[PDB]
Paper text:
The sulfonamides (sulfas) are the oldest class of antibacterial drugs and inhibit the bacterial dihydropteroate synthase (DHPS, encoded by folP), through chemical mimicry of its co-substrate p-aminobenzoic acid (pABA). Resistance to sulfa drugs is mediated either by mutations in folP or acquisition of sul genes, which code for sulfa-insensitive, divergent DHPS enzymes. DHPS catalyzes the condensation of para-aminobenzoic acid (pABA) and 6-hydroxymethyl-7,8-dihydropterin pyrophosphate (DHPP), producing 7,8-dihydropteroic acid (7,8-DHP); this compound is further transformed, ultimately leading to tetrahydrofolate, an essential precursor for DNA and RNA synthesis. All three Sul enzymes adopted the (ɑ/β)8 TIM barrel fold also shared by DHPS.
We determined the crystal structure of Sul1 in a ligand-bound state, and the Sul2 and Sul3 enzymes in both apo and ligand-bound forms to resolutions between 1.74 to 2.8 Å. Comparison of Sul apo and ligand-bound structures revealed conformational changes in these three loops triggered by ligand binding. We noticed that the Phe residue that is conserved across Sul enzymes (Phe178 in Sul1, Phe179 in Sul2 and Phe177 in Sul3) and localized to the active site adopted different rotamer conformations depending on ligand binding.
Residue numbers in the entry:
A (entry chain C): -1 to 14, 23 to 50, 57 to 129, 137 to 263
B (entry chain A): -1 to 130, 138 to 263
Write the structure that this text describes.
Amino acid sequence: QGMSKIFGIVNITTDSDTDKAIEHALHLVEDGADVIDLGAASSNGVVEEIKRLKPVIKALKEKGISISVDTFKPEVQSFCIEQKVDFINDIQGFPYPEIYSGLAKSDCKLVLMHSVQVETNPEEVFTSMMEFFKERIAALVEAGVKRERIILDPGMGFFLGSNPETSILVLKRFPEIQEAFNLQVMIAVSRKSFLGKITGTDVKSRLAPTLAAEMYAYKKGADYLRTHDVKSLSDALKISKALG
Amino acid sequence: QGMSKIFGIVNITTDSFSDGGLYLDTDKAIEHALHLVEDGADVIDLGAASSNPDTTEVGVVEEIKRLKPVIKALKEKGISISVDTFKPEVQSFCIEQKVDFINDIQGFPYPEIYSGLAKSDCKLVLMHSVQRETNPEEVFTSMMEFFKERIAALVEAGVKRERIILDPGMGFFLGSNPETSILVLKRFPEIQEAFNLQVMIAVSRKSFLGKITGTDVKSRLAPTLAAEMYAYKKGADYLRTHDVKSLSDALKISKALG
Ligand SMILES: Nc1nc2ncc(CO)nc2c(=O)[nH]1
Ligand SMILES: Nc1nc2ncc(CO)nc2c(=O)[nH]1
């Protein structure tokens, strides 16, 4: 029942020049987003990724906008280390110990996401997820990163396997991750394919299956939420809180 | 938390509206009904009221003329029909048509039609409304007494108690005060226990939702869905909505998520 901070998804490439992604990043802030999750990915490339970030990064910092960057490459990550973005989203969970001490000299909060790319007993995935967090958080702490800087993401959708039951189990049991490590947790359900396998609808185009899962996560204590339609979630969270 | 029926709103007057001519497209309303049903609607809430207040005998026979083809066609396909009208002459036409529900936003205040309502097998949607700056607490108390007096006067005439569905009213029907709508939304389970009757919640696209967020809720679904979700988990028996598919798809997520 805690107020969740919204993460606005802005993809730099599919929106673009830089201005179409910039104006998409301020319209979401004008809609109730606390942090803008910047993504700039194409096909097949470190300089190409960074070149699209620099104009959007410092433009949002010129207006005091908290920025999250979705990158799994350490060279792109070390760039975000010294640009001093407020968040750095890694869908791989920092598996390369090269930049470990590099992440300790910084202060940007780290987001530790877990995935399991093939046979899914849905609870066995949860247990190994508990052990994955226990080993990766410790090694990050041993490298100098403060424990108060890690945010856990249990993964969702195709990051948990083609089985929709796996994503349902984690959506019901993510409070257990909250109290086992005493740390914040973000849930990302927006337009993920497994929502269509439950309702039989055209995902990526239907907001309501998506909205129902984000309110459920908010009502169970999710600290952060990652979505596309921000003004829809912002109004869903305003109604949900005022309604008791 | 449990079951919930969905009322599909079909404004026959709106589906036959004015793009440069009025109330001759009697098939758009019929297609809007059959559409909403394959989106997950349980009952079709037909509404053929005039665009502006009309209280003559012509507006009566005009309301039946807009309901007569839509009611008939939906009957041939086994569709639960609910008529959204507050006129006694229109309601008597719905009784002889064997319509499933009669949705009255005035709470049936005319005793002349009580005789016709007793013989009917249709269910009744008794709605409560407000006088016209009343404190939200006193609106709830007067609503309780209003249901208590009107339910008795209906069973006195011969309407079996179990056919009465209670609607507390929402938004402008409770006043321009948003907290009055919030109080009813978070305290309506007290209605189902005091009267042991079903309760219908109708929040779809009401102005008070915009006063809480600050967005145009008349054409948007997110605040309508958030409020419709809360009433579902709180045990609302029926749900009157516009976007049936978005609510039906939403109910399929909460049922899987538990
Ligand atoms: N933290 C987090 N980030 C993501 N980035 C991209 C995508 C692709 O949908 N998913 C996610 C996600 O599920 N969680
Ligand atoms: N049963 C019921 N019917 C309504 N009809 C029209 C309108 C106006 O939107 N409201 C309602 C309502 O709140 N409850």
